[PDB]
Structures are given as structure tokens and as C-alpha cells.
Design an enzyme around this catalytic site. Structure first.
Site: not given
Ligand SMILES: CN(C)CCNS(=O)(=O)c1ccc(N/C=C2\C(=O)Nc3ccccc32)cc1
Length: 278
Positions: A18, A118, A122-123
Site C-alpha cells: 500500500v 480479517d 492495522q485495518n
Molecule cells: C509510512 N508508515 C510509517 C505509515 C504507517 N503507520 S501509520 O502512520 O499509522 C498509517 C498511515 C496511513 C495508513 N493508511 C492506510 C490506508 C489508507 O489510508 N487507505 C487504505 C485502504 C486500504 C488499506 C490500507 C489503507 C495506515 C497507517
């Protein structure tokens, strides 16, 4: 894909990587996931499954035998927020707001016969306004070690035709983890996961779960552990929260509370929508 500029890697997802990306036509910041006709059709149906607590699937691009899913972007996941709140704990009103919103998202999807399958921190994505949204909804039907911590016991026992109840189990596990600041069942193998569940909730039997002993991966040689009180498992959650949690963690998927019935639970009588400290 020449219409998207990659900004940064935001996850090593289940089906692929992603990225945070910018759409050159609209100027939109998105999450781009790089992943058969059966899949194109099921994924196309998810574009219509729109709700405020579901991360929006903006587009599906099938080009040069690769599949790209373009999603709405959110800046943080619940795993990061739980880690950042480990010393203080997430305030109970915010836990309650998040659980309520996630149950609304699940009630919606489940009403359309769509399962997540799932759910995990994280999701679950959060914004500055106090919203929380379900990400990667429906991709498991359509298509690093995958975590087993939130997997329902019927899946671990070999039920191949499981129900919407699997998502309620996962959400109950997440609720418990927000409250206690520790995962409820952190198994590192399928049997470790199953036996961690049994050590807390008791080894299931025909009394509490009719048909359990006939399930594919059920073994009469499983050890017989006694059930623990929830007052020991999720302190300092109040009796309304413990009652709800117990109903979300029933062994029998048919006894397990539905998302729609959980919304009516007395735990939500004083629900509010606080702003998180991000
Ligand atoms: C670069 N790094 C360190 C980031 C990881 N950690 S976080 O900052 O918690 C973080 C920041 C952004 C996200 N987004 C994930 C998704 C999004 O936006 N739409 C989606 C649709 C489907 C699947 C995933 C996402 C997650 C964590």
C-alpha cells in the site's frame, strides 16, 4: 497508473504493498494498493458498498495483468494510535465511540451479506475528527506472517462456511485490547491461538457450542481448561462493557451478538464522539 505519483509506502498489506499517492487529474491524495474475472466482479461490487465507517474504494484499475485498488487515504491506523496511547490508555469515551462506529460499519456490510474476515488494528483507520473506518472490506472473499490474533474459533476449527459472526469476534478482541492495552489472544500458531482462547474462555464442548466436537479440526484430545471471569480478563471495564464483550466472544457463532443488536446494548446509552489526541 501514469495518472498517480507515489509519495510513500504506508503498509506491506496482505495482498500487496500500500502506497500513499497523488492523483494528477483531480489533485487527490489516495492510498494505492498493488495486488481473474471472479475477482474483478467481486471487487467491482465493493465500489458500491459505501458507508461513512468504510474506507472508500475509489477505483479498480486492471492493467498489464496487475490490479490496483485506489482507496480514500487516512493518516493513521489504530495500531499506531494504541501504541502511542500505551502509557496513558485510550480514554473510555473514545474506545466506546470507536466500537460504536465500527459496529455501525459492520451492521451495514453484514446487511448487504458482505464480510470483512480479517479485522485487525492495522485495518482500522482513524482521522482527526474522531472517525474510525474499516479498511480492506470484502478483499478476503475476492482474493510477513498474517496475524491470527483476531481469528474466530470456528475458522481455527475448520469451518469453511463461516458467517458474519467472525467479524464480531475480531471486533471483540480489538475492544478488549483497547481497554487493557495488551492483545487478548496473541497466538503465534493456529494451535497456540486456539489454546490461548480455550485457556481464557474454557475449552468448548457440546453444552456451550452444539456441533463443536464434529468440526473438521476438533480433536477429543484437546486439553480441558476451565473458563475465567471477565472481571479478570478486562479490568477496569464496567459491567455493561463486560456483558457486551462476553456476547461478542460467545463460542457458538449463532449465539454471538449481531452488530445491529450490539448497537442497542446499554453500553452505548452514553456514547459520544470525542476528538482524539493525534
Ligand atoms: C509510512 N508508515 C510509517 C505509515 C504507517 N503507520 S501509520 O502512520 O499509522 C498509517 C498511515 C496511513 C495508513 N493508511 C492506510 C490506508 C489508507 O489510508 N487507505 C487504505 C485502504 C486500504 C488499506 C490500507 C489503507 C495506515 C497507517
Amino acid at each position: 497508473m501514469e495518472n498517480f505519483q507515489k509519495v510513500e509506502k504506508i503498509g506491506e498489506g496482505t495482498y500487496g504493498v500500500v502506497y500513499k499517492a497523488r492523483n494528477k487529474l483531480t489533485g487527490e491524495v489516495v492510498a494505492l494498493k498493488k495486488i481473474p474475472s471472479t475477482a474483478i466482479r467481486e471487487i467491482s461490487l465493493l465500489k458500491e458498498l459505501n458507508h461513512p465507517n468504510i474506507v472508500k474504494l475509489l477505483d479498480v484499475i486492471h492493467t498489464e495483468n496487475k490490479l490496483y485498488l485506489v482507496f480514500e487515504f487516512l493518516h493513521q491506523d489504530l495500531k499506531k494510535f494504541m501504541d502511542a496511547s500505551a502509557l496513558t490508555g485510550i480514554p473510555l469515551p473514545l474506545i466506546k465511540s470507536y466500537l460504536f462506529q465500527l459496529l455501525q460499519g459492520l451492521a451495514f456490510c453484514h446487511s448487504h451479506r458482505v464480510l470483512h474476515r480479517d479485522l485487525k488494528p492495522q485495518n482500522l483507520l482513524i482521522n482527526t475528527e474522531g472517525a474510525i473506518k474499516l479498511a480492506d472490506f470484502g478483499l478476503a472473499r475476492a482474493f510477513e506472517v498474517v496475524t491470527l490474533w483476531y481469528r474466530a474459533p470456528e475458522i481455527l476449527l475448520g469451518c469453511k462456511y463461516y458467517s458474519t459472526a467472525v467479524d464480531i469476534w475480531s471486533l471483540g478482541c480489538i475492544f478488549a485490547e483497547m481497554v487493557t492495552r495488551r492483545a487478548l489472544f496473541p497466538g503465534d500458531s493456529e494451535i497456540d491461538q486456539l489454546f490461548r482462547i480455550f485457556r481464557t474462555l474454557g475449552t468448548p464442548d457440546e453444552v456451550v457450542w452444539p456441533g463443536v466436537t464434529s468440526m473438521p479440526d476438533y480433536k477429543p484430545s484437546f486439553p480441558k481448561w476451565a473458563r475465567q471471569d471477565f472481571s479478570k480478563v478486562v479490568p477496569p471495564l464496567d459491567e455493561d462493557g463486560r456483558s457486551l464483550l462476553s456476547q461478542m466472544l460467545h463460542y457458538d457463532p449463532n449465539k454471538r451478538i449481531s452488530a445491529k443488536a450490539a448497537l442497542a446494548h446499554p453500553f452505548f446509552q452514553d456514547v459520544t464522539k470525542p476528538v482524539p489526541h493525534l
